[PDB]
Amino acid sequence: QVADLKAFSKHIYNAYLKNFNMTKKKARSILTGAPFVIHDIETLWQAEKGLVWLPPYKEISVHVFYRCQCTTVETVRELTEFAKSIPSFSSLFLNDQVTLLKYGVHEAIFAMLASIVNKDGLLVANGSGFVTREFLRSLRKPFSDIIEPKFEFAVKFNALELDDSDLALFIAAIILCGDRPGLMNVPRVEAIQDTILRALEFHLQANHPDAQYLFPKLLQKMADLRQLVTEHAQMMQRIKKTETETSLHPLLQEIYKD
Amino acid sequence: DLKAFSKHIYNAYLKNFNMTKKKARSILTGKAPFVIHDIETLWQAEKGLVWLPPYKEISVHVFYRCQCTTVETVRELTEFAKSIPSFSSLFLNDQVTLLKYGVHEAIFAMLASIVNKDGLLVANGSGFVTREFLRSLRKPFSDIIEPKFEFAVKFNALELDDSDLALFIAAIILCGDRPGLMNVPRVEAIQDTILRALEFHLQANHPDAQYLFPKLLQKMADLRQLVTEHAQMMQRIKKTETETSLHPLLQEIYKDMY
Ligand SMILES: CCCCCCOc1ccc(C[C@H](CC)C(=O)O)cc1CNC(=O)c1ccc(C(F)(F)F)cc1
Ligand SMILES: CCCCCCOc1ccc(C[C@H](CC)C(=O)O)cc1CNC(=O)c1ccc(C(F)(F)F)cc1
Ligand SMILES: CCCCCCCO[C@@H]1O[C@H](CO)[C@@H](O)[C@H](O)[C@H]1O
Numbered sequence: 001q002v003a004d005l006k007a008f009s010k011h012i013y014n015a016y017l018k019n020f021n022m023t024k025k026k027a028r029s030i031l032t033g034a035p036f037v038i039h040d041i042e043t044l045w046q047a048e049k050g051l052v053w054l055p056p057y058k059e060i061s062v063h064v065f066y067r068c069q070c071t072t073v074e075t076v077r078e079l080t081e082f083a084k085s086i087p088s089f090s091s092l093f094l095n096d097q098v099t100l101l102k103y104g105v106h107e108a109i110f111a112m113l114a115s116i117v118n119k120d121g122l123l124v125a126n127g128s129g130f131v132t133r134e135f136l137r138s139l140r141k142p143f144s145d146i147i148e149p150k151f152e153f154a155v156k157f158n159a160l161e162l163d164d165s166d167l168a169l170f171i172a173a174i175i176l177c178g179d180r181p182g183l184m185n186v187p188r189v190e191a192i193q194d195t196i197l198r199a200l201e202f203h204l205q206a207n208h209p210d211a212q213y214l215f216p217k218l219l220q221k222m223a224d225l226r227q228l229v230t231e232h233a234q235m236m237q238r239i240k241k242t243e244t245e246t247s248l249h250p251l252l253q254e255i256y257k258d
Numbered sequence: 259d260l261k262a263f264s265k266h267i268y269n270a271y272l273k274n275f276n277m278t279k280k281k282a283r284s285i286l287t288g289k290a291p292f293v294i295h296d297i298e299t300l301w302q303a304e305k306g307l308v309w310l311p312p313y314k315e316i317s318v319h320v321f322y323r324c325q326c327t328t329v330e331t332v333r334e335l336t337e338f339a340k341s342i343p344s345f346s347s348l349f350l351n352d353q354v355t356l357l358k359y360g361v362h363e364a365i366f367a368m369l370a371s372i373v374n375k376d377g378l379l380v381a382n383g384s385g386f387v388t389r390e391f392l393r394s395l396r397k398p399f400s401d402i403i404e405p406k407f408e409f410a411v412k413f414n415a416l417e418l419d420d421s422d423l424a425l426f427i428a429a430i431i432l433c434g435d436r437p438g439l440m441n442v443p444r445v446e447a448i449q450d451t452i453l454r455a456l457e458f459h460l461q462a463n464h465p466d467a468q469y470l471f472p473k474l475l476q477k478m479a480d481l482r483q484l485v486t487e488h489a490q491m492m493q494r495i496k497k498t499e500t501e502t503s504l505h506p507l508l509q510e511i512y513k514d515m516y
C-alpha cells in the first residue's frame with residue numbers, strides 16, 4: 001500500500017503535466033514578474049486585436065460570457081484527456097466516464113481557476129493577458145453574478161498554498177466521485193477514489209510535513225466546490241431564462257441539462 | 259487515401275473482434291463444436307465442455323448468456339470505434355450517444371457471421387446452439403430469437419466478407435441522426451466518408467455484384483427496424499419478468515428507446 005501510493009501519485013502528476021496548458025507554477029511565475037492588462041472596453045478590444053488573441057457579437061458583458069464558455073470547453077478537453085490517463089478510469093464503461101466528467105468538470109475547473117488568479121484578476125489567453133477583478137465585476141447582471149463567488153473561493157483556496165503535484169491528485173479525486181447521478185459501477189468508482197484519497201494523504205504528509213490539518217481541509221474544499229457549482233448552475237439557469245438572445249455552447253447545454 | 263481509409267478500418271476490425279466471419283465459416287463448414295440442442299446438452303456445455311446472476315430457470319439462463327455476449331461485444335465495438343478516423347475526435351458524450359444507439363444494430367449484423375440456418379456458434383466457436391432449441395424456450399424469452407435468424411439468413415445471402423463488414427459496421431456506428439447527437443454535421447461528414455469508401459470497396463471486392471451498395475443501405479434500414487422491435491420485446495420482458503435481471507449496461511442502452 002505505502003509503496004504503491006508514491007508511484008500512483010507520480011503517474012497522476014505526469015498525466016497532469018502532459019495534459020493541462022497552464023500550471024500553477026507557470027501561472028505563479030507570470031504573476032510575480034508581461035501580460036497585457038484588460039480593465040475596460042478599450043483594452044479588451046486591444047486584446048482581441050492581436051495583443052492577446054465565437055458567436056456573433058452583441059455587447060461587452062455577453063462577449064465576456066462567451067469567452068468564459070470557451071475556456072470551459074477547452075478545459076473540458078484537457079480534463080477528459082487527464083482522466084483517461086488515470087489508472088482504471090479508462091476501464092470504466094464509456095458512459096460511466098461521461099457521467100463522471102459531466103458532473104465533475106465544473107468542480108475541477110473552479111479549483112483550477114484559483115491557480116491562475118490573485119485578488120486583483122485573472123490570467124487569460126495562455127497568460128498573455130490579465131483581466132482585472134474590477135472590470136469583471138463591472139459587467140451587466142445577470143452575467144456579473146457568476147464572477148465574484150469564484151474569486152472569493154479562489155482566494156481562500158490559494159491560502160492553502162498547494163502546488164501542481166497536490167492539485168493533480170485533488171482534481172483526480174474530484175473526478176472519480178462515487179455519488180454522481182446515474183453512475184453505473186458505483187463500487188468501482190468508490191474504489192478508485194479511495195486509492196486516490198489514500199495517495200493524496202500520503203503525498204501531503206511528504207510534501208507539506210508541517211501543514212496543519214491539510215488533508216481534511218482539502219476534503220472540506222471538495223464539499224465547498226460542490227456547493228459552489230450548485231450556486232453557479234442556479235445562476236446559469238437565470239441567464240438561460242432571462243437572456244434568451246445569448247447562446248450557450250452545445251457542450252454546456254449537455255452538462256447543464258437537468 | 260480512400261483505400262487507406264478502408265485498410266485502416268479493416269485493421270481496426272481484425273484487431274478488435276476476436277471471431278471473424280472467415281474463422282466462423284471455417285468452423286461451421288469443417289476445416290468440431292459441441293452441439294447444444296436440449297437441457298442435457300446445455301448442462302454438459304456449462305460443465306466445462308464449453309465454458310452470472312443466480313440461477314432461476316433454463317430460459318432465463320440462456321437470456322443471461324445473451325446479455326453476456328452483448329456486454330462483451332459492446333466492449334469490442336467501443337475499441338473498434340475508438341480506432342476509427344475522427345470518431346475519437348468527437349466529444350466523449352457524442353461517442354457514447356453513437357454507441358448507445360449503434361451497438362445493437364452492429365451486434366445483429368455481426369451475429370450473422372457466426373450463424374447458419376440451424377443455429378449459432380457460442381463460446382468462441384466451441385459450442386453450437388440450435389435454432390430449434392432456442393425457439394423452444396419459454397415466452398417471452400423465445401420471442402427475441404426468430405426475427406434475428408430471419409434477418410441473418412437473408413443477410414448472409416449477400417456473401418459479404420470481413421473487409422466489407424468492417425466498413426458496414428463503421429457506417430452503422432457513425433450515424434448522423436442518432437437522438438441527442440451534439441455535433442450532427444461532423445458525424446454526417448464522417449458517415450459520408452465511410453459510405454464512399456464502402457461504395458469504392460464493393461466495386462473492387464465485388465466487381466460482378468449488382469446493386470450491392472443500395473442493398474447494403476437497405477440492410478442498414480432493416481437493422482434499425484429490427485432493433486426497434488427488439489427493444490420493445492426487451493421492455494416487455496422487463497415489465498412481465500420482474501425477477502429476471504437486466505445487466506446495468508443494457509438498462510442504460512434501452513432506457514429511452516420506443
Ligand atoms: C478564480 C475565479 C475567476 C473568476 C472569473 C470568472 O471566470 C469564470 C466564471 C465562471 C465560469 C464557468 C462557465 C460560465 C460560462 C461555465 O458555466 O462553464 C468560467 C470562468 C472562466 N473565465 C475565464 O477564463 C475568462 C473570463 C474573462 C475573459 C475575458 F478576457 F474575456 F474577459 C476571458 C476568460
Ligand atoms: C442471428 C443472430 C443470432 C440469433 C440468436 C439469438 O441470439 C441473440 C438474440 C438477441 C441478443 C440481444 C441481447 C438479448 C439480451 C440484448 O438485448 O442485448 C443477443 C443474442 C446473442 N445470443 C448469444 O450469443 C447466445 C445465445 C445462447 C447461448 C446459450 F448457449 F447459452 F444458449 C449463448 C449465447
Ligand atoms: C460503452 C458504450 C455504450 C454505452 C451505452 C449506454 C449509454 O447510456 C447512457 O449513458 C449516459 C451517460 O454517459 C446517460 O446520460 C444516459 O442516460 C444513458 O442512457
Ligand SMILES: CCCCCCCO[C@@H]1O[C@H](CO)[C@@H](O)[C@H](O)[C@H]1O
Binds near residue numbers: 080098101254351352
Ligand atoms: C466531453 C466529456 C464531458 C461531457 C459532459 C456532457 C455529457 O452530456 C450528457 O451526455 C450523454 C450522452 O453521452 C447524454 O445522455 C446526457 O443527456 C448528456 O447530458
